[PDB]
C-alpha cells in the first residue's frame, strides 16, 4: 500500500479526448519516465443501496467490492464468479459500467497513470493517479504528492483527497485507492455535458 492521489484533468480547448492523453503522456515521458507495462481498471455496478466492484490490473488476482461509505472487501477473482452465480438473485443495473485504460509511466519510485474513463464505448474525461510505494505513511506524504503534481500536472492539481480524511497514523490501504476511484467514477458518470 503506497499513498496515491487520483484526479480528473479536463481536455480543454478543442483538444479531442484522445489528443489530450497523447499530449499529457508525452509530457510525462518528458520527465525521464519509462513505461512499465499497461494498466486496466474495469468497474461494474449494482443498484443494491448501490454495490460497486472494481479491479485494477496492478493487482493481478484481487477484485474489490465497495459499498459506498460501507466497508470494502478485497477478495479473490472467484468473487466475480460468485457474483455471476447469484446474478439471477442479484440486481444488475443498466450499462453503468465505467473503465479507465491508459499507459503506466515510472519516474524513480513514483508510478503515474493517466487514463480516459471511457464510458461504455465513448470516452469522456481523464483520471490521473500518482502512487508512492516507499511511502507507507499517508496524510502527510501529501506534501510529496503535491510537489510532484505541480511539477507535471501544473494547473488543475488536486488539493488532496478526503480518503486521507481525519489526521491519523493509520496506514494507507488498497481500499483507499479504490474509494478515490469510486468517487472519481461517480463524478464522470454524472458530470454530463
Amino acid at each position: 500500500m503506497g499513498v496515491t492521489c487520483v484526479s480528473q484533468m479536463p481536455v480543454a480547448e478543442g483538444k479531442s479526448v484522445q489528443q489530450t492523453v497523447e499530449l499529457l503522456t508525452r509530457k510525462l515521458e518528458m520527465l525521464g519516465a519509462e513505461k512499465q507495462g499497461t494498466f486496466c481498471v474495469d468497474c461494474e455496478t449494482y443498484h443494491t443501496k448501490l454495490m460497486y466492484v472494481m479491479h485494477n490490473s496492478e493487482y493481478p488476482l484481487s477484485c474489490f467490492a465497495l459499498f459506498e461509505n460501507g466497508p470494502c472487501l478485497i477478495a479473490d477473482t472467484n468473487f466475480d464468479v460468485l457474483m455471476v452465480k447469484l446474478k439471477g438473485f442479484f440486481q444488475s443495473a443498466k450499462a453503468s459500467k465505467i473503465e479507465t485504460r491508459g499507459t503506466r509511466y515510472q519516474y524513480c519510485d513514483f508510478l503515474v497513470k493517466v487514463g480516459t474513463v471511457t464510458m461504455g464505448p465513448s470516452a469522456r474525461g481523464i483520471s490521473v493517479e500518482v502512487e508512492y510505494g516507499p511511502c507507507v505513511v499517508a496524510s502527510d506524504c501529501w506534501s510529496l504528492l503535491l510537489e510532484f503534481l505541480q511539477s507535471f500536472l501544473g494547473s488543475h492539481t488536486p488539493g488532496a483527497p478526503a480518503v486521507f480524511g481525519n489526521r491519523h497514523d493509520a496506514v494507507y490501504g488498497p481500499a483507499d485507492t479504490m474509494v478515490q476511484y469510486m468517487e472519481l467514477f461517480n463524478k464522470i458518470r454524472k458530470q454530463q455535458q
Partner: protein, 50 residues
C-alpha cells in the same frame, strides 16, 4: 501455498505474486553461486597482491 492464500485479502502487487511463484532451476542457481565464488576469490587475490 499459504502466501498465495494471503495474496487475496492482504492484497499483493505483481512483484510479490511473481516472487512467490518463480520459475528458476538448479543449474541457474549453481552457476550464480560458482560465479560469486570466483568473483570473491579474484578480489581476494587482487588485494593480496596489492
Amino acid at each position: 501455498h499459504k502466501r498465495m492464500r494471503l495474496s487475496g485479502p492482504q492484497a499483493f502487487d505483481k512483484n510479490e505474486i511473481n516472487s512467490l511463484q518463480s520459475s528458476e532451476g538448479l543449474l541457474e542457481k549453481i552457476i550464480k553461486q560458482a560465479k560469486h565464488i570466483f568473483l570473491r576469490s579474484r578480489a581476494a587475490a587482487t588485494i593480496d597482491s596489492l
